[PDB]
C-alpha cells in the first residue's frame, strides 16, 4: 500500500497504551519498508520492518516477512546519553504459493492475530511457561 | 499454560469465520505442543505448534516459536479421495533475554497482534503489494 | 507423573509462606524435568529440577536426583538490572537397586522428610550448629 503513519491502539498488557510509527522509507538494496517510533533519537527507538518477495528461479512462492525490534534505555550515572541494555525481537514470515487465493491468505493473517490473544500464547510469551 | 481447545473467532477477510483447535499432546523429544483441527485424515488438518526453549550453554536467549500450517484440498479427474495441493505456512519467532521484565514481553505480543490488523499489513498479505 | 503446577504451602521459617512452581519442560538429552516460580526477570527465579533414571530391563541401580537453587536480588547503584549476590543450593540424591520394593523406597523418603522437621536439622542448617 502506502507508507503512512501507523497508530497502534490498545497495545500493551493492560491495553491502554499507544505506539505511533512514522515511515522511514524503503531500502533500494533489499526492498524493505521501515518504520520507527514518533519522537526518539536514532538507534534508541522502536523499529518495524516489512518486505514482500516474488517468485524467482530460486523460490517458487511468495514470502511476506515482518520483523519488529524494540530496545531498553538505561540512563547510567555520569553520562548524558542513554545506552541500550537489551533488545527484544519478533520476526514473522509467511509463505504463500502462486495459486493461493485472497481468502486463504487472509485466513492465515487473521488466525495469527486471534491466536496471540489466547491463553495458550499469553502464558507462553509474557510468562515463558511451556504448554503442558 | 495447559492444552485445551483454543476456539478462535472473527477470522477471515470479512470477519465471520471461526476455527476450533483440538489438542494433540506435547512431543517430549523437542518440547513442541500441538493443536489440530477435527479432521479424520491427518493430511487435511489445520495444525498449530508452539514451543518455548530455555537458554542452553549456546543460545543464551529464550525463544518462543509458533508455527501455523493450512492445507487446501481438491480432487482431480479420475481420482476419488481429495489430495493436498497447497500449503500456506506461518512462522513467528520471539526472542528475549534473561533480564527482560514481563511488560516488555507483553508489549511485543500485543504490538504484533495490532500490526496484523492495520491497513499497511492487510494489503501486503491479502493483496501481495510491497509497501510503496 | 505428568508435570503440573505445584503449590507448596506452609513453607518457610515461620511456616506461613507459599511457593507456586510452574512446569518448564523436559530436557531431552539427559531427561531432567524442570520447575520454576512465576517471578519476573527470569535470571532470578526459584528453580527446582527432578531427574529419574529410565526404567530399562538391564539397569542395576535406580537413582533419583532433586536440586533446588534460590537466588537473592541486589539492585546495585548505577545499573538498571538487579544482579544475583548469592545462591542457596540443595542437592538430594537417592539410590536404589532393582530388587528394592515400594515400602523400602517410601521409608527413606518419609525419613528424610521427617529429619528436616526434627530439631537436630532445624538447628544444623538454620543456625549452622554442628552436632557434637
Amino acid at each position, epitope marked *: 500500500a502506502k507508507l503512512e503513519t501507523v497508530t497502534l491502539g*490498545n497495545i*500493551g*498488557k*493492560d*491495553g*491502554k497504551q499507544t505506539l505511533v510509527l512514522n515511515p522511514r522509507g524503503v531500502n533500494p538494496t533489499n526492498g524493505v519498508a521501515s518504520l520507527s517510533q514518533a519522537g526518539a533519537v536514532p538507534a534508541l527507538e522502536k523499529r518495524v520492518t516489512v518486505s514482500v518477495s516474488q517468485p524467482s528461479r530460486n523460490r517458487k512462492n511468495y514470502k511476506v516477512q515482518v520483523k519488529i525490534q524494540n530496545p531498553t534505555a538505561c540512563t547510567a550515572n555520569g553520562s548524558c546519553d542513554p545506552s541500550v541494555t537489551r533488545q527484544a525481537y519478533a520476526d514473522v514470515t509467511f509463505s504463500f504459493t502462486q495459486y493461493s487465493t485472497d481468502e486463504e491468505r487472509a485466513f492465515v493473517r487473521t488466525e495469527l492475530a*486471534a491466536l496471540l*490473544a*489466547s*491463553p*495458550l500464547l*499469553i*502464558d507462553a510469551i509474557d*510468562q515463558l*511457561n511451556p504448554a503442558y | *499454560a*495447559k492444552l*485445551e*481447545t*483454543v*476456539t*478462535l*473467532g*472473527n477470522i477471515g477477510k470479512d470477519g*465471520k*469465520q*471461526t*476455527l*476450533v483447535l*483440538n489438542p494433540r499432546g506435547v512431543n517430549p523429544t523437542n518440547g513442541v505442543a500441538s493443536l489440530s483441527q*477435527a479432521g479424520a485424515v491427518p493430511a487435511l488438518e489445520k495444525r498449530v505448534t508452539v514451543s518455548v526453549s530455555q537458554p542452553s550453554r549456546n543460545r543464551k536467549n529464550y525463544k518462543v516459536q509458533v508455527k501455523i500450517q493450512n492445507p487446501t484440498a481438491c480432487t482431480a479427474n479420475g481420482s476419488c479421495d481429495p489430495s493436498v495441493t497447497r500449503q500456506a505456512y506461518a512462522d513467528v519467532t520471539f526472542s528475549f533475554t534473561q533480564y527482560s521484565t514481563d511488560e516488555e514481553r507483553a508489549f511485543v505480543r500485543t504490538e504484533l497482534a495490532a500490526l496484523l490488523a492495520s491497513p499497511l499489513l492487510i494489503d501486503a498479505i491479502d493483496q501481495l503489494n510491497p509497501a510503496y | 507423573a505428568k508435570l503440573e*503446577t505445584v*503449590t507448596l504451602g506452609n513453607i518457610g521459617k515461620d511456616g506461613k509462606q507459599t511457593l*507456586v512452581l*510452574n512446569p518448564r519442560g523436559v530436557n531431552p538429552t539427559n531427561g531432567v524435568a524442570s520447575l520454576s516460580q*512465576a517471578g519476573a526477570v527470569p535470571a532470578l527465579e526459584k528453580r527446582v529440577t527432578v531427574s529419574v533414571s529410565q526404567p530399562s530391563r538391564n539397569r542395576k541401580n535406580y537413582k533419583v536426583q532433586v536440586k533446588i537453587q534460590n537466588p537473592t536480588a541486589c539492585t546495585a547503584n548505577g545499573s538498571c538490572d538487579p544482579s544475583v549476590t548469592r545462591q542457596a543450593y540443595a542437592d538430594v540424591t537417592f539410590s536404589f537397586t532393582q530388587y528394592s520394593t515400594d515400602e523400602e523406597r517410601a521409608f527413606v523418603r518419609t525419613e528424610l522428610a521427617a529429619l528436616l522437621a526434627s530439631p537436630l536439622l532445624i538447628d544444623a542448617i538454620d543456625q549452622l550448629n554442628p552436632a557434637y
Partner: antibody, heavy 117, light 108 residues
Framework: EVQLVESGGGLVKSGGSLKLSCAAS????????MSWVRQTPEKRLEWVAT????????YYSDNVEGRFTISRDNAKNNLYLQMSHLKSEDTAIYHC?????????????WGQGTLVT | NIVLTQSPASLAVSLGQRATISCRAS??????????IHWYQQKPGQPPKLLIY???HLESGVPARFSGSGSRTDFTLTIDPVEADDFATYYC?????????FGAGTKL
C-alpha cells in the same frame, strides 16, 4: 488444582453496595479471562459479566450494566465485583467461573459462591 | 437473546433405561462448521460441572457414558444406562452471542 474461593455476601437491604472477591489459586490467573455467574433461588443460572485477560474488554448483561462494575488484580490474583442499587431481584449465589480458551466463554471451572440478598 | 427452551421440565427413569433430554434454540447456533451448545450437571449441594462442550466433545473428567448431537435448532443428550451418580440437574448454555443465555434445566 484449579480452585476459586469466594468471599463477601450477607444480608444487605435494597439500595446498598457490596464487593465480592475470588481467591483463584492453582493456575496462572493473569492469562485467562474471568466471569461472574449467578444462580437465583428459583434454581436458574444467569450470566453477570466477563472481564478479559488484562482487564481491557468487558461484557455485561442487560440487568447488570447500569449499576455493577467488574475488575481484577493480576498481582494479588483477585477478581472483584462492585455492586450498587440492589434492586430486590439479585438474591443469588454468585459463582466465580474460569473462562475457556476462546472468543466467548463456556465456563470450564467453577466455585462455591456467596449468598447475597 | 437466544432463548433455550428445555423440552421436558422433569424426567424419571430406572437404573437400566436410557435417558434423553433436548434443548431447543431460538436461532441458529452452528456458526461455521461447529455448534456452540454446552452441557452442565449440577448436584444440589455442589457447583455445576461441565459435561459436553461444543455439543459433541466430552470433558476429561466425564466417565464417557454421555453423548450429544444436533444441528442448528435441537441438541440432545443420551445416557446409556443411567448409574447412581447420574441423578442430577442438567442445564444447557449458548455461546454464539454476547448475552450468553442459559437453559431452564430439568431434574431426575
Amino acid at each position: 488444582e484449579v480452585q476459586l474461593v469466594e468471599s463477601g455476601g450477607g444480608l444487605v437491604k435494597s439500595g446498598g453496595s457490596l464487593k465480592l472477591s475470588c481467591a483463584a489459586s492453582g493456575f496462572t490467573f493473569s492469562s485467562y479471562a474471568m466471569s461472574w455467574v449467578r444462580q437465583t433461588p428459583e434454581k436458574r443460572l444467569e450470566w453477570v459479566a466477563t472481564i478479559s485477560d488484562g482487564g481491557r474488554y468487558i461484557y455485561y448483561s442487560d440487568n447488570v450494566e447500569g449499576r455493577f462494575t467488574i475488575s481484577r488484580d493480576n498481582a494479588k490474583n483477585n477478581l472483584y465485583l462492585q455492586m450498587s442499587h440492589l434492586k430486590s431481584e439479585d438474591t443469588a449465589i454468585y459463582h466465580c467461573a474460569r473462562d475457556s480458551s476462546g472468543y466467548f466463554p463456556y465456563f470450564s471451572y467453577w466455585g462455591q459462591g456467596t449468598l447475597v440478598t | 437473546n437466544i432463548v433455550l427452551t428445555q423440552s421436558p421440565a422433569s424426567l424419571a427413569v430406572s437404573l437400566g433405561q436410557r435417558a434423553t433430554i433436548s434443548c431447543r434454540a431460538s436461532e441458529s447456533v452452528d456458526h461455521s462448521g461447529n455448534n456452540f451448545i454446552h452441557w452442565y450437571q449440577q448436584k444440589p449441594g455442589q457447583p455445576p460441572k461441565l459435561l459436553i462442550y461444543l455439543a459433541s466433545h466430552l470433558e476429561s473428567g466425564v466417565p464417557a457414558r454421555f453423548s450429544g448431537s444436533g444441528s442448528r435448532t435441537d441438541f440432545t443428550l443420551t445416557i446409556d444406562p443411567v448409574e447412581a451418580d447420574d441423578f442430577a440437574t442438567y442445564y444447557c448454555q449458548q455461546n454464539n452471542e454476547v448475552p450468553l443465555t442459559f437453559g431452564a434445566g430439568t431434574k431426575l
